[PDB]
Amino acid sequence: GGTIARTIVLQESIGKGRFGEVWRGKWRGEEVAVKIFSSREERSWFREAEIYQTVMLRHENILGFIAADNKDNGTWTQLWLVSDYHEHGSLFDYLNRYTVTVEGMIKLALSTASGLAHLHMEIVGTQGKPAIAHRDLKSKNILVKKNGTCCIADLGLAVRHDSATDTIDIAPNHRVGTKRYMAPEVLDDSINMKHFESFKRADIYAMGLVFWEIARRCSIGGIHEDYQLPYYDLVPSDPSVEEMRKVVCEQKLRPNIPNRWQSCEALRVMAKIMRECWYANGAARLTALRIKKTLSQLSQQEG
Numbered sequence: 001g002g003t004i005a006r007t008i009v010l011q012e013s014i015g016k017g018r019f020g021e022v023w024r025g026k027w028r029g030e031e032v033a034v035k036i037f038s039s040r041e042e043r044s045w046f047r048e049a050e051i052y053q054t055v056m057l058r059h060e061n062i063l064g065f066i067a068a069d070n071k072d073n074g075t076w077t078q079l080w081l082v083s084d085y086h087e088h089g090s091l092f093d094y095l096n097r098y099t100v101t102v103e104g105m106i107k108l109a110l111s112t113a114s115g116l117a118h119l120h121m122e123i124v125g126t127q128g129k130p131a132i133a134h135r136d137l138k139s140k141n142i143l144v145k146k147n148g149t150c151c152i153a154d155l156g157l158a159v160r161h162d163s164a165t166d167t168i169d170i171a172p173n174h175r176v177g178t179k180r181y182m183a184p185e186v187l188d189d190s191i192n193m194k195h196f197e198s199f200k201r202a203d204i205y206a207m208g209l210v211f212w213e214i215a216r217r218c219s220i221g222g223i224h225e226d227y228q229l230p231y232y233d234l235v236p237s238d239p240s241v242e243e244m245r246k247v248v249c250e251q252k253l254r255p256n257i258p259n260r261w262q263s264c265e266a267l268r269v270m271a272k273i274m275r276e277c278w279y280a281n282g283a284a285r286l287t288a289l290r291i292k293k294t295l296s297q298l299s300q301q302e303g
């Protein structure tokens with residue numbers, strides 16, 4: 001019989017994502033994470049399975065994928081994905097619970113950037129890894145490991161690019177992700193989806209917002225900000241595309257950068273990265289690799 005789902009015991013409900021539902025389970029004397037889909041959610045199950053099985057995808061800052069499988073209880077079939085389990089949960093949860101040191105901030109930011117750089121980067125060869133854009137990067141889709149570093153998850157909306165033929169593997173729809181984190185060009189539909197760089201640039205804008213969430217929680221001399229989502233001060237809790245568009249495209253506002261961040265070199269560098277992720281024109285934004293290089297340079301200097 002099968003070696004995966006058949007041999008796993010579910011222990012704890014984690015919650016519902018975009019599709020399916022997450023659980024903590026036990027496999028071969030080890031805790032694992034399981035995402036369970038119904039039969040009518042096969043398209044979303046297969047697609048996430050497909051992205052995670054991409055050659056050369058594994059990276060310390062991407063969720064470690066174990067397997068896709070199904071399980072029959074005798075009445076209905078469940079479609080399963082199985083991965084590493086991370087006890088701390090999402091970066092959103094982590095930042096609500098805790099403040100971080102300067103070192104902690106740099107580890108969380110650098111690990112996020114490194115994960116995104118890996119997704120984004122095409123690797124040549126027989127084991128040819130295409131460039132991959134996430135399309136729904138947010139603090140709730142980044143997990144925090146026990147070592148205080150991040151890994152990116154929720155790859156079901158991702159798109160993959162073949163540079164030789166300049167083709168994307170699926171036909172992309174507009175505005176598929178979380179409205180709050182959508183780039184200006186996504187919000188106003190001006191994004192050119194026949195230009196794969198556009199998807200990478202939209203991811204970068206979203207990472208900038210995530211960086212802002214982290215920096216708020218960096219505590220120096222006991223001084224820090226409360227946890228907030230980006231645009232907490234300007235839109236409703238579950239904002240529409242029009243509400244986001246009015247703030248981000250028309251009024252041209254971005255999350256507020258405190259002046260107390262000027263007083264610290266680490267926060268000064270992070271603040272600069274955010275601004276350079278937040279330009280309305282995606283072509284002006286930093287790349288994930290450049291951000292990784294900068295934070296790696298900063299990480300060396302700090303400790």
Ligand SMILES: COc1cc(Nc2cc(Oc3cc(C)c(C)nc3-c3ccccn3)ccn2)cc(OC)c1OC
Nearest residue numbers: 022033034035081082083084085086089090141153154
């Ligand atoms: C204890 O509270 C939380 C724990 C975790 N841990 C966790 C969750 C995971 O979920 C996934 C599992 C699988 C197999 C796949 C394909 N994806 C995910 C996933 C994770 C995040 C976003 C989207 N998909 C994987 C590893 N560790 C997570 C929590 O929230 C996300 C917790 O708080 C509810």
